[PDB]
């Protein structure tokens, strides 16, 4: 199960820049074997690191590798461009939550000011001095075509790149069998609808007002022996990734208890 990684993470590069491609599997003493495929075609190179001393137009295309394993690596599309400016991306296709690095790279590393970054046509960030853009956590809203503009001698533009953000599961719903306000003493079961697994274990949490219901090592529910008038309010549960990498807090669901 190989996987391709790029030294310059950048999937789109200028002519004459250096880029080395490594196929790496986490084995300490792993044999030096590699099977590179291009446009469905194996290259003669077997070393796990694809070094490009001087890139070319012909160096462009989709890259895949196989090293000492059953199956083959994911296909990675590499594009070499010509022009003045280049919006550089760490990835073309990713699921939300994975971080995304962007770079508006200038020719010959020339200095550019009043740099603009675009998402789906809308400028969302301006930089007086050229800077990297890192989204610590991505979502489907980050999906779309990116552009960049900056001021050198004149307002130059970069080419657009399509970025694909895959959503894992849409936000869950906590549903109650009854409408609020409610009567005192009732035992209530609250269910957080999801009903779908992306293709693991879930930690759930319940809160009350600006304060907090117990946080310790929570499971999915609680039983209210006696629902009381003081219990009228907004109830919610929480969904997050194993990593905590992707986490969703939930919207307030009001429950009013009368008694």
């Amino acid at each position: 199960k190989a996987v391709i990684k790029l030294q310059p993470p950048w999937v789109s590069v200028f002519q004459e820049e250096s880029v080395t491609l490594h196929c790496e599997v986490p084995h300490l003493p792993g044999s030096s074997s590699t099977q590179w495929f291009l446009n469905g075609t194996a290259i003669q190179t077997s070393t796990p690191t694809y070094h490009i001393t001087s890139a070319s137009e012909d160096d462009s295309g989709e890259y895949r590798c196989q090293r000492g394993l059953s199956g083959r690596s994911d296909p990675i599309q590499l594009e070499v461009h010509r022009g003045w400016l280049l919006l550089q991306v760490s990835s073309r296709v990713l699921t939300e939550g994975e971080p995304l690095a962007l770079r508006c790279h200038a020719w010959k590393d020339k200095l550019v000011y009043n740099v603009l970054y675009y998402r789906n046509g809308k400028a969302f960030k301006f930089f007086h001095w050229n800077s990297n853009l890192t989204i610590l956590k991505t979502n489907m809203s980050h999906s779309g075509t990116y552009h960049c503009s900056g001021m050198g001698k004149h307002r130059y533009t970069s080419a657009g790149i399509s970025v694909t953000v895959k959503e894992l599961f849409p936000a869950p719903v906590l549903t109650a069998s009854v409408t609020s306000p409610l009567l005192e003493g009732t035992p209530v079961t609250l269910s957080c609808e999801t009903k779908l697994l992306l293709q693991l274990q879930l930690y759930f949490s319940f809160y009350m007002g600006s304060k907090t219901l117990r946080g310790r090592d929570t499971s999915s529910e609680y039983q209210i022996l006696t629902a009381r008038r003081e219990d009228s309010g907004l109830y919610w549960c929480e969904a997050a990734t194993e990593d905590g990498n992707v986490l969703k807090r939930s919207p307030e669901l009001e429950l009013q208890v009368l008694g």
Partner: protein, 218 residues
């Protein structure tokens, strides 16, 4: 050349009032200090409005407009006294923002040079034109300075709907001249309608003059 060069920051453009604003007392002339490249991070803008060096207040502010490119645009309008402007009083705009190392002193003031009163001469159509369905009425304006000006054509107490006026042109004497061409149906002329060319300029008595036209044997 108020172009003291520095490095990469928000930019300011300072715009003079509209001439008609300068010309009709029943109108309100404005000076305009325009600020671009304001970040969302630093959207706070300070205006100082030194007039000849005397800081004034009572500058206003139209609402900021988010630009498509996601910068902010801010406009400041300083109301101006008619006589203040024509005497060439200086209007200085100072712009403060935390992201600027040093303050900006955009400067403006009325164009310099000897104001010169226009001569106005009205000219009837060439006889050769009298053969057409439409005829050309000519208003010649020359000798004026500065080139800043407003011109209108009128008939029967109403502006005519079909005249054209040239941009100012630099004359050989350092002054400017221009032409405004009014077009009218032949019938109306030969029916002896009276047409008027109206001109507004600093250097005319009451900033205004008109010339009339009808046959004149002698």
């Amino acid at each position: 050349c108020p172009a003291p060069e520095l490095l990469g920051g928000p930019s300011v453009f300072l715009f003079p009032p509209k001439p008609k604003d300068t010309l009709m007392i029943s109108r309100t002339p404005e000076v305009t200090c325009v600020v671009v490249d304001v970040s969302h991070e630093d959207p706070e803008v300070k205006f100082n409005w030194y007039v000849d060096g005397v800081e004034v207040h009572n500058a206003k502010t139209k609402p900021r407009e988010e630009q498509y490119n996601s910068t902010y645009r801010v406009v400041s309008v300083l109301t101006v006294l008619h006589q203040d402007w024509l005497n060439g009083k200086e209007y200085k705009c100072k712009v403060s923002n935390k992201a600027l190392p040093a303050p900006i002193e955009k400067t403006i003031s009325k164009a310099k040079g000897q104001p010169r009163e226009p001569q106005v001469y009205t000219l009837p159509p060439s006889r050769d034109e009298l053969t057409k369905n439409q005829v050309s009425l000519t208003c010649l304006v020359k000798g004026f300075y500065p080139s800043d000006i407003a011109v209108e054509w009128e008939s029967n107490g109403q502006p005519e709907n079909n005249y054209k006026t040239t941009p100012p042109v630099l004359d050989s004497d350092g002054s400017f001249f221009l032409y405004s061409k009014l077009t009218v149906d032949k019938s109306r002329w030969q029916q002896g309608n009276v047409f008027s060319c109206s001109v507004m300029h600093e250097a005319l008595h009451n900033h205004y003059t008109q010339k009339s036209l009808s046959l004149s044997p002698g």
